[PDB]
Structure 1
Amino acid sequence: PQDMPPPGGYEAVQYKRNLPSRGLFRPRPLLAGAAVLMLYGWYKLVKGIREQNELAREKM
């Protein structure tokens, strides 16, 4: 015979746009995530510099 489609017909294939949204790129959790790192970092930086400042007192 000849190259023919299957008797049922080939199943439908994906062609419509599929770029689904994901939570890893929504800005609201990203903004919350960035704020926490900055807040945590400044908490550690206040404690760090205050300690460093006390070390200069002892050294002097």
Structure 2
Amino acid sequence: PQDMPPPGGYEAVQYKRNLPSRGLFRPRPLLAGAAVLMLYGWYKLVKGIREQNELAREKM
């Protein structure tokens, strides 16, 4: 026999465009989490510089 398809034919393949939006790359959560990092970082910075200026007062 020659090279034929199987009796019922092959099952469908995937060809339609498939680029599904993933929550890892959405501009709301990224902006929000950026704001939390950026606001906490300034919080620690206020503590740090306030302590360093006091450390500077003792050295003087």
Please give the root-mean-square deviation of Cα atoms over the aligned residues, in Å: 0.3
Give the TM-score normalised by structure 2: 0.99
Q: How many residues align?
A: 60
Secondary structure of the residue aligned to 2:44 is helix
In structure 2, distance between residues paired with 1:48 and 1:6: 73
Determine which structure has greater relative contact order: mean sequence separation of CA pairs < 8 Å that are 6+ residues apart, divided by chain length.
1
> Tell me, which stretches of 5 or more residues in structure 1 are unaligned?
none
In 1, distance between residues paired with 2:9 and 2:28? 46
Distance (Å, rounded) in 1 between the aligned partners of 2:6 and 2:19: 31
Q: Structure 1 residue 34: deviation in Å?
A: 0.4
* TM-score between the two structures when normalised by the length of structure 1: 0.99
